[PDB]
């Protein structure tokens, strides 16, 4: 299951759902679009 908005990613953007991208600073998924 892909990591939704404001959920702690795998550092690599390996998990964040379609329309998300993991922040460098926060290490959580945030809106790509």
For the chain, domain boundaries: 1-33
Q: How far apart are CA 33 and CA 30, in angstroms?
A: 9
Q: How far apart are CA 1 and CA 24, in angstroms?
A: 21
Give the angle 24-18-7 at the CA atoms, nearest 5°: 50
Contact yes or no for 3/9 (Cβ under 8 A): yes
In the chain the beta strands, taken as DSSP E runs, fall at 20-22, 29-31
Q: How far apart are CA 6 and CA 15, in angstroms?
A: 12
């Amino acid at each position: 299951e892909c990591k939704g908005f404001g959920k702690s990613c795998v550092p690599g953007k390996n998990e964040c759902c379609s329309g998300l991208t993991c922040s460098n600073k926060h290490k959580w998924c945030k809106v790509l679009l």
